[PDB]
RNA sequence: AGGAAGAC
RNA sequence: CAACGCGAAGAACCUUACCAGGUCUUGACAUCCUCUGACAAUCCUAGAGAUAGGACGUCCCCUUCGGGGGCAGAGUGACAGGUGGUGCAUGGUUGUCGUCAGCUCGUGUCGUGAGAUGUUGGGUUAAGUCCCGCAACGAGCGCAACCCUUGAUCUUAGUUGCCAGCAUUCAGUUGGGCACUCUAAGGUGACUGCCGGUGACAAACCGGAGGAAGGUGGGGAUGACGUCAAAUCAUCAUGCCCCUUAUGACCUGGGCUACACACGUGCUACAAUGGACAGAACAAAGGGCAGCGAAACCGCGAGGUUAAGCCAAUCCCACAAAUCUGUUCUCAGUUCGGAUCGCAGUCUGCAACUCGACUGCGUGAAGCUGGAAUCGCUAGUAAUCGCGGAUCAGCAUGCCGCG
């Protein structure tokens, strides 16, 4: 079973990565390291002024990034335990 | 007169091609972004306030 | 032709966001609805002088935390605000809400409260210069590392509109690890419309 | 301000023939190279057995006969916009010589590129040349107006 | 109207057909610049809105492929 | 089985040279209809001839990304890394001969209000 | 010690 | 200069404010008074708009039978609306000088005073950057650094990559494995760190060495006090003006795209450092579910058909051109150049005449590198060649980004 997670904040996604690795390792779930997936980018350009001065512009970056983990063995009781485990509100888990 | 055309914006139009996009947090057409429904002015003001958590200053 | 907004320049690199979630393919109507929460909270809690609100999504539950720096005239009997806010917010958004309050110790170093203080003396019609000196004295007697204050508009003179600045300490706007709290407030008087911009250098980040 | 130059080396220092190595692998770039250089090599061959001797020394005296020694600049003095001749640094000599070679070769106009390039190489080989005559125009202006120093 | 035929205002289409199948009558009042001239409309009189008035036009036999709109240009120059 | 890496102008290449009889090959297609633009020929013939290690090693080259001249520069850096890996006894001679620069000359970020990140559009009074 | 050059 | 591919990151009808036509008075937009307490949709007559009447055709929940939960409508006045004028009534934003290196204060000296000093002078720097004399000693905003990205490596992390080391097949897809590119966290790293010579030995400058780069490695973001009563009442807001049986409203059609002209910015060329045709190529960065749409078939073409895969390092856009080898044209208004024009179409959309894009034809125009003057450009920079993306049903030579 593969679990993805994609969000903006790579700090709290990193501590979420070792926290899920720690839970899966203490459950003994044939753990695999979290693979860094490439980010996705969207750069928007806004008129700096309100009414005039078209050469005055500003750029706003949006960057969001994803990581993947894999569990080889079934281990359904620990899988249901990590389903019922609570998650922070930024980790954005996808099954 | 702006909120007459705001009433056009929330009301469904006669034919479906007559429908157009307005950002509806602030009051204008003309450079609304589709995926936020905010135009440049109210977008950049509320982004400097700090909402839309994907957005920050851009440099590379 | 002015400085770029410092909180908007600091967010993402040093400043954490005030919203910590993701929405996919429904991002637009969550931004519309949670700005409806933020305007409603501002409109009904301007007396209680919230510094900032911050939200998160709990898989079709939303959590709100409100920073007000006083329980005194805010919480009432203790449950009055949470019932009158939670039922009303449920009625507005149609989703499960949860609300929590937080307080700011050493409460005169928060910029939004400082700009609201200046604005409140401007509808109190005490003189703007006295407002600047009293707020500078209040912020230094609370303790700080730098304050810059600006009030612009028609300051009592009808035929001219000019700004006034008052500062103390160091406020570098160009060092990134500086933690400026910035605030803009709007004051409506019989003379007209006045803009306040206060920005405070509280400390340092390593 | 101040001038500054850099260092860079394309060829090998030893066991490297300068003109042969230049001829095979150096300083003509950005496309239309292959067919042009093969037909240019056989243009070199047809002028090789068109002349009655080795062709490299007549190519090099063609480079001498296009290669300028002095030119004259314009300086603002008085109300006449007078001209001042000047002695020339060797890199500027090389840049001017190749620059007049290529632009008058592309500028006179002929059937096609290889025979026209050979046409002004042979036109520089003999003394009666067009851009050669321009080099002596630069001199006859220079030693017409070198009473200014 | 590129592959499947002329695209018109059917209400006054059936109105002018029920006119001409019975008799010949007065000018047809229309605000609509929309319509293509159908080939069975030969010999009628159409009052087209130019923006300020309803100009009268007779329909000749040569109304082969072009729509009704060119009968009333909307700009006056010299 | 000495293995080297090379990067130049948004392109990478990896080289593997083992003791052979002096064979040189990129992508298992040969010189004639695989290698145009004889700057590549002087690329593939310069360093083996300036060293005394020409007919001893055979090299397989794998290629990813980029254009022709930047690819040639990636070949330069790959074979320079391969030789400094294999025979470091004259690696210092290779150093002050040069060719180890790994130039940072990549495409410039286009600036807003400018055409090519140097060119302002046009000006008039 | 090395040009004549108006008005707002 | 700092207006003129500017607000507009997209006018067929709404956008749309402007014009004509026909229509409204508590109006769709916010709250009080009183009922019904659930409202509407389907087809006609006019219908284009309100309107007027018709076929089922004003249809929830708590309920001590009293009434409430604001959604829908109905009549009423307080009303609401103004993209209408005032940027010289204003806040809020922005350009400019200008990434120019400057702009000031505290305390104290000198001066009757305005003022001065610090902030001048010497040596270097890109810098008021550093240091030595000095009635100055300090401080603050600026400069530089910290931030992001591109530049090499160690550890960890190998799928939806890598096929090195192996066995296998035209699809090298697979059975197996992370060392490399690759994606990325912690870093390692370049900081005047050593030698010599100058510099009173200080700060600095020049030449040398492991190095990926030596003297802020390249770029971005960052724009001080102020000036131009610079620009915006087009997001919001006391100040007056008209209305509220109307500059405020509903819709249909038109206009914003007109045209004797002059200008700003760009595109395409005038060609054999090419055109046409044929073959081999090298593959950056983004977008995709009211979507991206592969294969195959049909079509002298844009396209159509049923449609596998993808909620994305797998599937699609994605078939990159300029590039490299062959034949032709042989210097011409030409096999250049492609604009106007007629015919016949494809797609989108209720609708392409006013006023969309694209294709197949035929027609082939001016133009043979452009006077006065004038513009941009210093370690992938100019120039060319393409490629994406944004507003959007559809419309690039505009703009942003990438190679």
Q: How far apart are CA E26 and CA E45, in angstroms?
A: 7
Nucleic strand H contacts from chain E, 5-34, CB < 7 Å: 7, 9, 11-12, 30-34
CA distances E59 to A51, E27, E29, E31, Å, are: 51, 11, 14, 17
CA D59 to chain centre: 11
B59 contact residues in A (CB cutoff 8 A): 59, 61
Nucleic strand H contacts from chain F, 61-90, CB < 7 Å: 62-71
3-state secondary structure chain D: CCCCCCCCCCCCCCCCCHHHHHHHHCCCCCCCCHHHHHHHHHHHHHHHCCCCCCCHHHHHHHHHHHCCCEEEEECCCCCCCCEEEEECCHHHHHHHHHHHHHHHHHHHCCCCHHHHHHHHHHHHHCCCCHHHHHHHHHHHHHCCCCCCC
Alpha helix segments (H runs only) across E8-76: 10-20
Neighbours of D3 (CB within 10 A): 4
Q: How far apart are CA E9 and CA E29, in angstroms?
A: 13
Give the residue among D92, D87, D93, D91 at the shortest CA–CA distance from D149: D87
CA C109, C115, C117, C118 torsion-angle sign: positive
Closest nt by CA–C1' to D76: G3
The token duo for C193 is 């419309």
The token duo for B18 is 């007559």
**Entry resolution (Å):** 3.3
Sheet holding E54-58, edge to edge: E28-30, E45-49, E54-58
A65 membership: H or E segment, kind and range: strand A57-70
Please provide the distance, in angstroms rounded to a whole number, between the alpha carbons at the two ends of chain C. 31
CA of F117 to C1' of H126 (A): 22
CA of F121 to C1' of H374 (A): 14
F66 near F9, Cβ under 8 Å? yes
Q: How far apart are CA D65 and CA D60, in angstroms?
A: 9
Contact F113 A57 (CB under 8 A): yes
User: Maximum CA pair distance of chain E?
Assistant: 43
Establish, for the pair of chains A and C, how many residue pairs have beta carbons separated by less than 8 Å: 18
Q: How far apart are CA F36 and CA F50, in angstroms?
A: 23
A2 membership: H or E segment, kind and range: strand A2-7
Q: After which residues is chain C broken (C to N over 2.5 A)?
A: none
Neighbours of E48 (CB within 10 A): 22
F51 near F83, Cβ under 8 Å? yes
B36 near B52, Cβ under 8 Å? yes
CA of E50 to C1' of H358 (A): 31
DSSP A19-64: HHHHHHHHHT----PPEEPPPEEEEEEEESSSSS-TT-EEEEEEEE
Q: How far apart are CA B22 and CA B31, in angstroms?
A: 9
Q: How far apart are CA C151 and CA C118, in angstroms?
A: 9
Q: How far apart are CA A84 and CA A86, in angstroms?
A: 6
Contact C32 B25 (CB under 8 A): yes
Buried b (16+ CB within 10 A) or exposed e, B16-43: eeeeeebbbbeeeeeebeeebbbbbbbb
A64 contact residues in C (CB cutoff 8 A): 22
Distance from CA of C78 to the nearest CA of B (A): 30
Surface-to-core class of residue C65, CB atoms within 10 Å of its CB (0-12 exposed, 13-18 middle, 19+ buried): middle
CA F48, F51, F53, F59 torsion-angle sign: negative
C98 membership: H or E segment, kind and range: strand C96-102
Buried b (16+ CB within 10 A) or exposed e, C186-196: ebebebeebeb
Distance from CA of A89 to the nearest CA of C (A): 6
C33 membership: H or E segment, kind and range: helix C27-45
Give the position of tokens 């910590």.
C20
DSSP F30-49: -HHHH--STHHHHHHHHHHH
Chains E and F touch (3+ CB pairs under 8 A): no
Residue C168 forms beta bridges with which residues?
C147
D129 near D68, Cβ under 8 Å? no
* Coil vs helix vs strand at C186: strand
C135 membership: H or E segment, kind and range: helix C128-142
Task: Compare CB distances from D12 to F38, F41, F50 and report the shortest one's residue.
Answer: F50
Q: How far apart are CA F95 and CA F80, in angstroms?
A: 10
Q: How far apart are CA F124 and CA F120, in angstroms?
A: 12
D116 near D36, Cβ under 8 Å? no
Residue F6 forms beta bridges with which residues?
F13
Give the position of tokens 């157009």.
B20
CA of C43 to C1' of H49 (A): 41
E12 near E37, Cβ under 8 Å? no
Contact D25 F42 (CB under 8 A): yes
Q: How far apart are CA E44 and CA E71, in angstroms?
A: 14
Question: How many residues are recorded in chain D?
Answer: 149
Q: How far apart are CA B4 and CA B18, in angstroms?
A: 16
3-state secondary structure B4-47: HHHHHHHCCCCCCCCCCCCCCCCCCCCCECCCCCCEHHHHHHHH
Q: In chain F, where do the E strands start and end?
A: 2-7, 12-19, 24-26, 57-64
What single-letter DSSP state applies at residue F111?
P
Neighbours of E64 (CB within 10 A): 7
Can you say whether residue E67 is alpha, beta or left, with left for phi > 0 and alpha for psi between -120 and 50 degrees? beta
Surface-to-core class of residue C135, CB atoms within 10 Å of its CB (0-12 exposed, 13-18 middle, 19+ buried): buried
* Coil vs helix vs strand at C123: helix
């Amino acid at each position: 079973i593969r679990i993805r997670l994609k969000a903006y904040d790579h700090r709290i996604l990193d501590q979420s990565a070792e926290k899920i690795v720690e839970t899966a390792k203490r459950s003994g779930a044939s753990v695999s390291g979290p693979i860094p997936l490439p980010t996705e980018k969207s750069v928007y350009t806004i008129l700096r002024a309100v009414h005039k001065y078209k050469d005055s512009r500003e750029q706003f970056e949006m960057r969001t990034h994803k990581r993947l983990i894999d569990i080889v063995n079934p281990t359904p009781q620990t899988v249901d335990a990590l389903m019922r485990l609570d998650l922070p509100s930024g980790v954005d888990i996808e099954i | 007169a702006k909120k007459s055309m705001i009433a056009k914006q929330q009301r469904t139009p006669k034919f479906k091609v007559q429908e157009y996009t307005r950002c509806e947090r602030c009051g204008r057409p003309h450079s609304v972004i589709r995926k936020f429904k905010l135009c440049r002015i109210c977008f950049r003001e509320l982004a400097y306030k700090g909402q839309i958590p994907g957005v920050k200053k851009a440099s590379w | 032709g002015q400085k770029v907004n410092p909180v908007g320049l600091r967010i993402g690199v040093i400043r954490d966001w005030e919203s910590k979630w993701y929405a996919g393919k429904d991002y637009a109507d969550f931004l519309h609805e949670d700005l409806k929460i933020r305007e409603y909270i501002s409109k009904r809690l301007s007396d209680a002088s919230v510094s900032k609100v911050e939200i998160e999504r709990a898989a079709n539950r939303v959590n709100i935390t409100i920073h007000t720096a006083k329980p005194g005239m805010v919480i009432g009997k203790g449950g009055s605000e949470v019932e009158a806010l939670r039922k009303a917010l449920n009625s507005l958004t149609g989703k499960r809400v949860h609300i929590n309050i937080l307080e700011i110790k050493r409460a005169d170093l928060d910029a939004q409260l400082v700009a609201d203080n200046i604005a409140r003396q401007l509808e109190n019609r005490v003189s703007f210069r006295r407002a600047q000196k009293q707020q500078i004295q209040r912020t230094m007697r609370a303790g700080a590392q730098g304050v810059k204050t600006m009030v612009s508009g028609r300051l009592g003179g009808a035929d001219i509109a000019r700004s006034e600045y008052y500062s103390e300490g160091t406020v570098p706007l160009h060092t990134l690890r500086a933690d400026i709290d910035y605030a803009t407030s709007e004051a409506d008087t019989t003379y007209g419309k006045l803009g306040v911009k206060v920005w405070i250098y509280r400390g340092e980040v390593l | 301000k101040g001038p500054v130059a850099k260092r860079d080396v394309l060829p090998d220092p030893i066991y490297n023939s300068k003109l042969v190595s230049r001829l095979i692998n150096k300083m003509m770039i950005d496309g239309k190279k292959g067919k042009s250089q093969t037909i240019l090599y056989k243009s070199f061959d047809i002028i090789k057995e068109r002349t009655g001797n080795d062709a490299m020394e007549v190519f090099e005296q063609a480079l001498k006969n296009i290669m300028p020694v002095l030119e004259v600049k314009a300086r603002r003095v008085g109300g006449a916009n007078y001209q001042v001749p000047v002695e020339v640094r060797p890199e500027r000599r090389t840049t001017l010589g190749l620059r007049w070679l290529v632009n008058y070769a592309r500028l006179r106009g002929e059937k096609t590129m290889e025979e026209r390039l050979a046409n002004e190489i042979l036109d520089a080989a003999n003394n009666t040349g067009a851009a050669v005559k321009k080099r002596e125009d630069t001199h006859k202006m220079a030693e017409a107006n070198k009473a200014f120093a | 109207s590129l592959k499947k035929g002329p695209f018109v205002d059917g209400h006054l289409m059936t109105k002018i057909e029920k006119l001409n199948e019975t008799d010949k009558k007065q000018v047809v009042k229309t605000w609509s610049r929309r319509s293509t001239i159908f080939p069975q409309f030969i010999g009628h009189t159409i009052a087209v809105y130019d923006g300020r008035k309803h100009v009268p036009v007779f329909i000749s036999e040569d109304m082969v492929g072009h729509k009704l709109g060119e009968f009333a240009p909307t700009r006056t120059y010299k | 089985q000495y293995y080297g890496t090379g990067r130049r102008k948004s392109s990478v290449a990896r080289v593997r040279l083992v003791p052979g009889e002096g064979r040189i090959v990129v992508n298992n297609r040969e010189i004639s209809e695989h290698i145009p633009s004889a700057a590549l020929i002087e690329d593939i013939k310069q360093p083996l001839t300036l060293t005394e290690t020409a007919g001893t090693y055979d090299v397989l080259v794998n290629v990813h990304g980029g254009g022709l001249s930047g690819q040639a520069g990636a070949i330069r850096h790959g074979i320079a890394r391969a030789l400094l890996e294999a025979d470091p006894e004259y690696r210092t001679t290779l150093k002050r001969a040069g060719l180890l620069t790994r130039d940072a000359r990549m495409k410039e970020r286009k600036k807003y209000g400018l055409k090519g990140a140097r060119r302002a559009p046009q000006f008039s009074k």
